[PDB]
Amino acid sequence: SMSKNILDMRNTVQIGIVVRDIEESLQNYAEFFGVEKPQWFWTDDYSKAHTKFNGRPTKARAKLAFFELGPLQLELIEPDENPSTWREFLDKNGEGIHHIAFVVKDMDRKVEELYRKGMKVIQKGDFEGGRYAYIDTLRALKVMIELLENY
Template sequence: MKRNLSFILIATVICIIMTSSVPSKKVDALIQNHKMAQVAIVVKDIDKARRNWAMVLGMDLPEVSVAKSHPSRPTKFKGTPSSAEAKLAFFNLENIQIELIQPLGGKSTWQEFLDTKGEGIHHIAFMVKGIDGLEKRFEMQGMPTDQNGGWDGGAYSYINAMQMLGCELELLENYGSN
């Protein structure tokens, strides 16, 4: 009898230990998608940067596009409308996208980063759903929106997570994928 009771006790403890060590996804996580979509680098000269990255990666030079405010979701920097523009170039790797950003003018998180820190990694990005609600949830956690805006079929939001996470986060939402 003692032997059976000891066995049951040991088996119970083992089950508790095994189930408590299994990582679980928190339902209330701010970011549900745990696959990073992008790393972005702010640069002074996008042509030089894309040539260097193309050489390092052994890839063709990507096209350069210009990001501007969009009428469906105008650009705002720290809550104020902004005429911010930037040149963008993208390297699509197997597991992540590298975005190069050269600010062209107007108040923006890109220009602020370049002015205060110089060239470097500006943000990491995640694909999300319900971007407006997420901005509010991040704000409630002490991480305000630095800049947001949109494009045909999507929206972006830069969350200032420097104090909490040591980096800026970008939330990306493609409306067609919802």
Template sequence: MENTILGTTLICQVAVIVRDVEKATRRFAELLGVPVPNIIMANEDGSDTVSYMGQPTKGRVRLSFFHMENLVLEFIEPTEDPTTWKEFLDIKGPGVHHIAFKAKNRMLETAAKLEQFGYSLIQNGDKYAYVESTEDLGVILELLDID
């Protein structure tokens, strides 16, 4: 549905903040009876330009991804870098952090529309943007610049 502010109604990812990404990844793989996916340290090399609350940050985070039939489930373990992920864990503890929508070639344009809608940009990198929507929706919205 291209007439939505998001440009789509398809949720492509759900992300969960955890204290121990190895444990969460291993246990979820056991639950599903699938191989344990790799755990990566995102932005370890600093190649992604990350901004949190308008300020630059290294934005490193430990991640694993489960490619389900209908979406990707992401487990996120924050580092000490200032990020929305660390803030979430520090304040709320583990839980669902965001749901994501594809916004290929229109990520910042869509973020600007969401800003007008009342959801401010809180963090972004080269391929993603988070907008603060928890007061209304109980979850952050992510825009992914992917196909």
């Protein structure tokens, strides 16, 4: 079921994986973990998302599917062709792990801490029930860190 307990995100780490065909990849993942297949959905349009990539607004949307595996939430991401961290990742790297996301209680102050540590937000936006911010950690950490805030 993956739904034995309701996901408590504050205590879960999410790994986002960018793929080209979400139906195919999500079937592969359901088979490997022997889990009931999750349903996928389109992220919000820009009018709700307010997506900003490298300071620029983008109409970018992506198909998403989630798997809950204990302490881990695996997120599959199939982006459209508009500009985004996901599309940029896909084109240039092919399918693979795009990010590791952590839920934080206060987005603003957390982003402050990282600014003081010399970091920067590469993409941010809203989603139903919260907001997110991708940090420019790829060169130093070898992977992109994302901050999530759930209202």
